[PDB]
Structures are given as structure tokens and as C-alpha cells.
Amino acid sequence: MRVLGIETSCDETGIAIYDDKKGLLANQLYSQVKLHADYGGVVPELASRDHVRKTVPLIQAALKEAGLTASDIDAVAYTAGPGLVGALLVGATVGRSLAFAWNVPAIPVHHMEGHLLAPMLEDNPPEFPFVALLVSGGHTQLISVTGIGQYELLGESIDDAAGEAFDKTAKLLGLDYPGGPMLSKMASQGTAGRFVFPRPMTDRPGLDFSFSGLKTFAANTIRSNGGDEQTRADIARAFEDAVVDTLMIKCKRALESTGFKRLVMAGGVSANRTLRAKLAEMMQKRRGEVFYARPEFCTDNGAMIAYAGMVRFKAGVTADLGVTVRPRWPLAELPAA
Amino acid sequence: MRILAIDTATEACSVALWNNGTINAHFELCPREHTQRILPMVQEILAASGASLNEIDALAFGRGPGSFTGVRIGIGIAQGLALGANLPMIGVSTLATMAQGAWRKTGATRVLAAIDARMGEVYWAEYQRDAQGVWQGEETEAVLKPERVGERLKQLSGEWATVGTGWSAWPDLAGLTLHDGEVSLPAAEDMLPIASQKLAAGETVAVEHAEPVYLRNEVAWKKLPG
Numbered sequence: 001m002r003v004l005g006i007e008t009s010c011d012e013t014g015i016a017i018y019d020d021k022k023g024l025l026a027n028q029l030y031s032q033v034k035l036h037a038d039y040g041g042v043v044p045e046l047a048s049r050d051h052v053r054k055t056v057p058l059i060q061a062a063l064k065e066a067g068l069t070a071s072d073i074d075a076v077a078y079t080a081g082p083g084l085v086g087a088l089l090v091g092a093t094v095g096r097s098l099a100f101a102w103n104v105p106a107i108p109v110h111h112m113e114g115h116l117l118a119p120m121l122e123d124n125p126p127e128f129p130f131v132a133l134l135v136s137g138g139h140t141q142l143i144s145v146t147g148i149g150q151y152e153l154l155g156e157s158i159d160d161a162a163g164e165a166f167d168k169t170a171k172l173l174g175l176d177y178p179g180g181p182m183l184s185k186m187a188s189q190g191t192a193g194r195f196v197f198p199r200p201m202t203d204r205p206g207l208d209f210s211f212s213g214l215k216t217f218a219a220n221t222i223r224s225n226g227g228d229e230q231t232r233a234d235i236a237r238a239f240e241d242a243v244v245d246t247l248m249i250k251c252k253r254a255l256e257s258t259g260f261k262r263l264v265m266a267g268g269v270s271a272n273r274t275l276r277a278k279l280a281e282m283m284q285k286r287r288g289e290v291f292y293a294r295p296e297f298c299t300d301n302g303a304m305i306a307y308a309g310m311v312r313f314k315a316g317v318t319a320d321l322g323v324t325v326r327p328r329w330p331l332a333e334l335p336a337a
Numbered sequence: 338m339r340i341l342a343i344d345t346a347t348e349a350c351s352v353a354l355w356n357n358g359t360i361n362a363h364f365e366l367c368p369r370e371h372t373q374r375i376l377p378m379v380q381e382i383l384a385a386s387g388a389s390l391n392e393i394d395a396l397a398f399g400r401g402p403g404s405f406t407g408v409r410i411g412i413g414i415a416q417g418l419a420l421g422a423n424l425p426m427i428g429v430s431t432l433a434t435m436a437q438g439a440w441r442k443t444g445a446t447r448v449l450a451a452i453d454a455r456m457g458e459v460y461w462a463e464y465q466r467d468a469q470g471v472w473q474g475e476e477t478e479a480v481l482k483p484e485r486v487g488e489r490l491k492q493l494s495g496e497w498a499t500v501g502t503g504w505s506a507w508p509d510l511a512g513l514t515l516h517d518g519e520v521s522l523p524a525a526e527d528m529l530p531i532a533s534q535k536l537a538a539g540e541t542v543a544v545e546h547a548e549p550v551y552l553r554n555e556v557a558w559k560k561l562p563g
């Protein structure tokens with residue numbers, strides 16, 4: 001079985017072809033970073049216009065990449081939400097009308113489920129049950145996964161998600177939007193323990209998060225110190241170490257509470273080098289296991305949508321002729337499979 | 338020939354099919370329901386004329402201008418269908434489509450098309466039908482302030498029919514002899530004679546070349562300091 005996946009929820013056009021026997025057959029990606037950088041954030045109108053010029057050519061390139069023709073595709077999967085209504089609508093209208101024209105089922109996919117299931121694309125995929133740490137731009141959640149579509153929210157952030165906290169501090173460190181990865185590169189040249197940032201919500205028990213106060217601590221530290229590269233790299237490292245220690249403490253607590261032996265990390269922030277090593281080390285001590293997506297499948301791609309689309313198609317999730325986008329769509333609201 | 342036309346650039350949802358002259362059409366006001374109504378309308382108009390999507394010779398689409406969202410719904414749906422069925426595509430101006438509608442309804446050969454774009458500006462065009470039924474004046478398509486339109490009306494002469502929501506938004510814009518064109522919104526059935534002329538001239542594009550015509554290309558965001 002072959003599923004074509006379409007991802008256009010934010011600033012990246014992702015097209016992929018996933019075969020449940022042979023694995024990933026094609027993976028195409030166009031990033032709009034340079035388009036939005038100058039505005040310091042994604043301009044919805046500019047993002048929507050760019051998905052229009054890249055969706056159809058990238059579908060055409062993905063088919064020629066995998067050396068397949070139209071009839072080799074059994075279903076079309078597209079991100080229906082959450083995301084930007086304007087960007088979502090590009091992939092959803094192209095995706096649904098393509099499925100109609102090819103006379104194949106169309107699969108609306110939840111973008112966060114896409115991220116969550118991205119580690120299922122690697123060898124030795126996680127078995128249920130597992131604790132999932134979803135660390136994205138807008139969300140930071142601890143989820144109890146007991147099956148596919150069986151997601152129990154254990155904890156979430158009350159303010160900034162870990163990803164936006166990374167972007168906000170990177171802006172203050174003079175980096176271009178989105179600065180999260182560049183902050184992490186700066187941090188790798190940093191001196192351990194030079195500065196010590198707090199770990200919010202870790203004094204009291206509970207699984208909820210808070211990162212807004214790290215932005216303020218960072219801002220005040222930048223102002224109270226010199227502007228040399230080494231100082232800024234030491235602040236970048238102190239910020240990263242605090243976010244990772246916080247995420248590690250909360251993951252530990254969730255594993256204890258649930259009683260689970262498996263931990264899965266997903267979302268853009270799960271690409272972080274320091275987070276991957278610290279969570280790996282903790283699971284080795286617990287005598288458990290960590291599961292990650294490859295770094296490219298941590299951020300927006302179409303492979304996770306073609307994969308999650310295939311799982312939903314096997315469970316009976318099909319779209320009617322009406323196209324529907326859900327810019328606000330909670331992971332808890334999605335039905336169990 | 339067989340031509341399928343679709344339009345969602347404005348507050349209306351419309352589809353139409355041309356089969357060597359005979360036309361089957363459907364039009365409806367679908368505010369906030371564009372994505373919910375377009376593919377059921379396509380499936381129904383094809384089933385009605387017993388036509389298969391694979392037998393279509395050209396897919397005509399509302400290229401704009403109009404609602405940015407609406408124009409992108411129309412191009413998205415048309416691109417998926419054309420890519421899926423390997424169909425040549427024909428972009429038809431929403432301004433010229435309303436001119437054709439005014440001619441079909443009133444016999445008007447000289448049309449002043451104005452769409453009420455947000456921010457108090459209008460999408461403007463001066464369209465004149467020639468002896469061959471071709472609407473001339475595509476180079477006049479622009480986004481203008483009503484004051485600039487009023488100045489432009491002083492430069493024109495004769496009898497004109499008015500079409501579009503621009504005249505609803507600014508009815509005090511109406512030296513010239515103006516008549517109501519009886520068209521506020523485009524219909525896909527009025528795209529079919531324009532698409533038929535374009536297909537005959539070999540002026541079709543492949544799916545990857547289909548582009549929207551927004552006219553307003555200015556961003557409603559300032560760039561970061563310096």
C-alpha cells in the first residue's frame with residue numbers, strides 16, 4: 001500500500017510517499033525561512049502564497065523521485081490542522097481534489113499526531129504503552145499513549161512552549177527567526193555552569209510546564225553581562241541546559257506516575273542534541289528505552305503525514321467531498337483508532 | 338470540445354460545463370462554505386452531463402483578483418483536479434467573467450468592472466467586447482482607490498455597464514452614461530466562452546504553471562528595524 005502525504009500547516013511544504021512494505025519512497029521539502037526571517041515571524045499571507053507555488057511541483061517531483069505513476073498511489077493524506085488556516089487550505093484543497101481526480105480515499109491528518117508518530121518511521125519502532133514528550137513551537141505536552149488514537153494528556157505548558165522559548169531567547173541573542181537551532185549551535189561552544197537559569201515548576205510536584213520566566217531571566221542576564229561571543233554562547237548554553245533539565249525532570253515524573261518503561265520524544269525541539277543525549281542517559285538508568293525521530297523528521301515534513309495518514313486510513317478515517325480545515329484542533333478531540 | 342469551469346474568488350461558489358456549445362451550470366452563495374461545496378458541485382455537474390473528468394479538454398479556473406483565500410481555494414481545487422486528470426488549465430479573470438455576465442444578461446459590450454477589495458480600494462478593469470466576442474482591456478486591470486477611479490471616469494466616454502461589489506461599496510462613483518450590468522459576482526458559466534477562445538488559440542498552461550492574479554501584492558506587515 002502507498003500513501004501520498006501533504007504537509008502545508010506552517011512555513012514548510014512537505015510531500016512524501018510512504019509504502020507500508022518498502023518504507024519511505026519519496027521525501028520532498030521546501031522551507032520558506034528566508035521569506036519570513038525579515039519580519040521576525042511567519043506572515044500568514046506570504047506563507048499561503050508560497051505553498052501555492054510549491055505544492056503541485058513537489059508532488060510531481062516526489063512521484064518522479066520514487067519512479068511511480070498516479071495509479072501507484074492508494075490514498076492521499078493531507079494536514080487538516082492545527083496550523084495557519086491560509087497555509088492549511090492550500091495542501092487540503094490540492095490534496096482532496098487530487099484524491100477525487102485519482103478516485104482514491106482522502107485522509108485528513110492531525111499535524112501533532114504526525115509529529116508524535118514520526119519515530120514509528122525508524123527501525124525498532126516503539127510498542128504501546130509509552131510516555132510521549134511533544135515539544136513543538138506552540139505546544140509542550142506529556143502524553144500517556146496506550147494505543148493509536150488513545151492519548152491522555154498528563155501535563156502541558158501554562159505560557160510559552162519550549163520551542164517558542166528557544167526562538168524568543170535566540171531573538172535576544174541577536175539571531176534570525178527562527179533561532180532555536182542557531183541558539184543550540186551557539187550553546188555547543190558554551191562553558192557548562194557559567195550561568196545557572198531556574199527550572200520552573202520543578203520545586204512542586206506535578207507535570208505542568210512554564211518557560212516564559214526563562215525568557216526574562218535570559219534577557220536580564222544578557223543586559224547584566226558583556227557582549228562578547230563567549231559570554232553569549234555561555235548564556236545560550238545555560239538557557240539550553242535549564243530547558244533540558246526541566247523537560248528531563250517532568251519526563252521522569254510522568255514515567256513514575258504511569259509506570260511505563262518507554263519514552264518517545266517528538267516535535268521540532270526533539271531534534272536538540274543536548275535533549276536527545278540527556279533523555280537517552282535517563283532511560284538507560286531507568287532500564288527502559290528512548291525513541292526518537294531522525295533529526296529531519298523532528299521538524300515539519302510530509303513523511304510523518306504520509307505515515308499517520310496510512311495508520312488513520314487502515315482505521316477507517318476517510319474524508320467526504322467537503323474540504324475542512326481545523327486551525328485549532330486539540331489532540332484529545334481526535335477519535336481513538 | 339469539453340470545458341469544465343470553477344470559481345470561488347468571491348462570495349459565490351460556481352461550476353459549469355461546456356460540451357461543444359451546450360452548457361450545464363450551477364451557482365450559489367457559499368460564504369464560509371467554499372471548501373464544503375466546491376467538490377460536491379464538481380461531482381454533481383459532471384454526473385449530470387454524464388461526463389468523466391478524464392474526458393475534459395481544459396479546466397478553466399477563476400485566477401482572480403478577489404478574496405486571497407477564495408482565489409487560493411479555486412486554484413487549489415483546479416490544480417488537484419488538473420494534476421490528477423492531466424488536464425490543460427485556463428486562468429480566467431474574475432473582472433472579465435463579470436463583463437461576459439453583463440453582456441449575457443443585458444447585451445452590454447462596454448463594462449466597468451470593480452470588485453470591493455478590503456481597505457477601501459477596488460480591483461478595477463475597463464472591458465470592451467470586440468466583433469469576435471473577445472473582451473479587450475486586460476492591461477487596464479489594477480487595484481485603485483475610489484478617488485483615482487473617479488479621476489479615471491472623467492477620462493472615459495460613452496455608454497458603460499457597471500459590474501461587481503466595488504459599485505456596491507462605492508455607489509457614489511456612478512459625462513458618462515452608466516447602466517447597471519446586473520452582476521455583482523462572477524459565475525463559472527460566463528468563464529466558458531472566454532476559456533473556449535483561449536483553448537482555440539492554444540493558450541492553456543500545464544498544472545505547475547497555474548498562477549493566481551492578486552493585484553494587491555503589498556504585505557500588511559512591516560519588516561523588522563533596518
Ligand SMILES: Nc1ncnc2c1ncn2[C@@H]1O[C@H](COP(=O)(O)O)[C@@H](O)[C@H]1O
Binds near residue numbers: 298
Ligand atoms: N535543535 C533544536 N534545538 C532547539 N529548538 C529547536 C531545534 N530544532 C528545532 N527547534 C524548534 O522547534 C520548533 C519547530 O518545530 P515544530 O513547531 O514542532 O514543527 C521551533 O520552535 C524551533 O526553534
